[PDB]
Amino acid sequence: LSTFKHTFVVADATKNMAIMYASAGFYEMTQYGPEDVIGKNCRFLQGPGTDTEEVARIRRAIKNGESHCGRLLNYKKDGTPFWNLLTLAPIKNEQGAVVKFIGMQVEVTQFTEGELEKAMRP
Numbered sequence: 168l169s170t171f172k173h174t175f176v177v178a179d180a181t182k183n184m185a186i187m188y189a190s191a192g193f194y195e196m197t198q199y200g201p202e203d204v205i206g207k208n209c210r211f212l213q214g215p216g217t218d219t220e221e222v223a224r225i226r227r228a229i230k231n232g233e234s235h236c237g238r239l240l241n242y243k244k245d246g247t248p249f250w251n252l253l254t255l256a257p258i259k260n261e262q263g264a265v266v267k268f269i270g271m272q273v274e275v276t277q278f279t280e281g282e283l284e285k286a287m288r289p
């Protein structure tokens with residue numbers, strides 16, 4: 168995991184799951200800037216049609232300190248909908264307390280026959 172490779176955000180469980188850090192990929196993906204992200208909650212990416220039950224699964228997972236993944240619909244700054252494969256993982260300290268969550272986002276795109284050929288024979 169690198170911040171100049173990958174797309175993720177870090178939430179502070181001690182400051183109410185406010186985002187404390189976002190990677191470059193996240194700003195590129197969503198088109199939002201730091202002023203729209205840092206200190207906020209990523210639920211701002213949700214919008215019309217976002218699945219309520221998936222969002223409830225995310226909420227329950229965070230409440231429980233559990234790892235999680237799920238596809239949900241999100242919205243870029245210009246209002247473009249995209250499918251977000253969101254992976255959540257808790258971060259604990261020494262004591263085994265959840266102090267942060269990391270969230271890793273993948274904008275769904277078509278996986279092609281070409282990419283598959285590449286994958287099995289790099």
Ligand SMILES: Cc1cc2nc3c(=O)[nH]c(=O)nc-3n(C[C@H](O)[C@H](O)[C@H](O)COP(=O)(O)O)c2cc1C
Nearest residue numbers: 176178208209210212213222225226268269270272
């Ligand atoms: C580290 C982290 C990253 C998150 N990233 C996203 C995201 O990219 N898109 C999204 O819709 N929700 C994301 N969420 C979920 C929202 O922050 C929120 O937890 C979710 O909408 C359910 O809670 P709510 O019902 O109070 O909104 C993320 C949560 C955490 C903790």
